[PDB]
Ligand SMILES: Cc1cc2nc3c(=O)[nH]c(=O)nc-3n(C[C@H](O)[C@H](O)[C@H](O)COP(=O)(O)O)c2cc1C
Ligand code: SF4
Ligand code: FES
Ligand SMILES: [Cl-]
């Protein structure tokens with residue numbers, strides 16, 4: 333397996349950034365998920381080499397950290413907060429809208445393979461509950477029509 | 488241009504930490520300078536490190552990351568150990584209800600940065616790290632840009648303002664583990680490993696990053712340091728009670744009218760936070776309970792306590808989640824149980840199994856599927872998550888839920 337030049341450039345950048353290469357592991361994994369929509373299993377042996385880490389270490393890191401997905405490819409991840417405050421304020425209303433618009437439930441990927449709904453713990457935006465993200469973007473859920481407009485920005 | 492972020496409401500009576508961060512926009516370095524910024528750094532660099540530690544000590548500044556440990560003392564303890572030393576800013580803010588640190592990060596990053604440089608000089612660290620949760624991408628990019636701004640202006644790099652002091656600040660991202668907020672797990676993460684808490688001792692201030700003396704401080708704690716240098720410790724001590732001085736950020740959520748962050752003195756009472764500042768309850772409903780994040784549960788009988796770190800004080804991070812009379816405490820307890828289920832790192836058996844079983848059984852209790860033995864089992868498990876635990880998570884995973892059992896016996900009895 334080979335990283336495309338454009339990705340590999342950014343990975344080497346992260347590796348150069350910290351005083352020790354291994355410290356860049358999460359920046360690298362973040363980068364790989366963004367490029368592919370997930371962490372390809374076959375991506376980890378070349379990563380490890382760039383990191384100068386044993387494959388087993390890199391694999392265990394991927395397993396530990398909840399944001400990294402090794403199974404499902406998805407262009408956009410809709411992280412819906414399922415913690416106390418958002419639950420109080422109306423998480424299930426947001427999930428209902430997502431079901432109406434996308435036809436999928438938490439943990440599922442559209443047959444399109446472009447949206448995955450990812451249930452997450454508190455997003456640190458509780459005053460604006462119910463809260464969700466679309467990849468790096470973060471929003472309060474207000475209404476179905478708003479959610480529609482928001483999701484339409486991602487193609 | 489940065490990733491979209493919500494507009495969290497903020498209000499202040501002291502106009503210190505939220506002088507700028509009360510407005511929801513990135514305040515870049517020129518606006519920071521125009522507002523008197525980087526004056527404290529200048530003053531600090533004309534002081535000795537030991538003087539800064541003394542001032543911070545005499546300020547009565549306490550950690551705002553949950554444990555309320557005196558900051559000056561932590562610094563003193565660290566510098567008892569030969570350098571090199573590292574300084575770490577903890578920006579993992581992942582506890583339910585807590586959104587106080589991000590508005591500093593995303594709106595007034597130079598306040599934090601100025602704080603980090605002063606704190607780093609104080610303990611003789613030439614290398615600093617911000618560990619920011621992965622779910623704060625905007626915060627990460629804002630901080631990266633701000634650091635480069637400060638570097639351009641000569642507040643970072645070599646020979647900062649001719650002082651002979653060198654500092655670089657690196658920004659690490661988390662990847663979705665609440666346990667990475669715990670200082671040893673954060674350090675494990677920083678070294679590019681799984682966020683497994685280390686057995687203590689040693690404590691980070693002796694052996695931390697690469698086994699070197701390491702000071703970990705919360706975003707909010709560090710954000711106070713410019714004001715201590717600027718005002719002086721005496722004037723800082725006059726803010727709120729001499730006992731627990733300075734501004735504090737209070738992230739207020741739930742069924743209040745005006746949810747947001749409030750900058751208030753810590754002698755403010757809980758009743759004041761909810762009713763005076765946050766505009767009381769939605770629909771003027773009666774307060775049933777206040778969850779201190781995922782740590783404590785205060786009933787409506789405990790509203791006239793101060794928001795300080797005294798024995799009868801609110802304590803914690805000042806996170807205020809307001810439950811009203813219409814809210815089901817068992818349902819709420821389950822959410823808190825669910826949190827701990829999903830965040831235990833699994834290293835310690837009672838934490839591993841306890842966090843799981845507490846949620847599993849509590850869900851059965853709420854669904855009305857629990858047997859008598861399930862109830863007894865839930866009781867036992869709730870009281871037995873802590874044994875053998877090597878971090879604070881195992882020790883507190885059953886705390887809030889237990890308080891709900893004690894303080895709201897009637898509501899639980901219904902489910903029996
Ligand atoms: C489970 C757990 C999670 C924690 N999460 C955070 C966090 O998100 N932010 C933080 O600053 N401290 C957090 N802490 C506390 C830190 O370990 C540490 O007390 C603090 O960062 C020290 O800085 P301070 O003295 O300025 O508060 C956590 C502790 C535990 C046990
Ligand atoms: S107490 Fe729990 S969270 Fe802390 S190290 Fe042990 S298993 Fe992990
Ligand atoms: S509970 Fe959802 S953002 Fe905190
Ligand atoms: Cl190296």
Ligand SMILES: [Cl-]
Pocket residue numbers: 438439449450451
């Ligand atoms: Cl999922």
Ligand SMILES: [Cl-]
Pocket residue numbers: 526527529530
């Ligand atoms: Cl000055």
Ligand SMILES: [Cl-]
Pocket residue numbers: 687877878879
């Ligand atoms: Cl401990």
Ligand code: NA
Pocket residue numbers: 419420818
């Ligand atoms: Na409910």
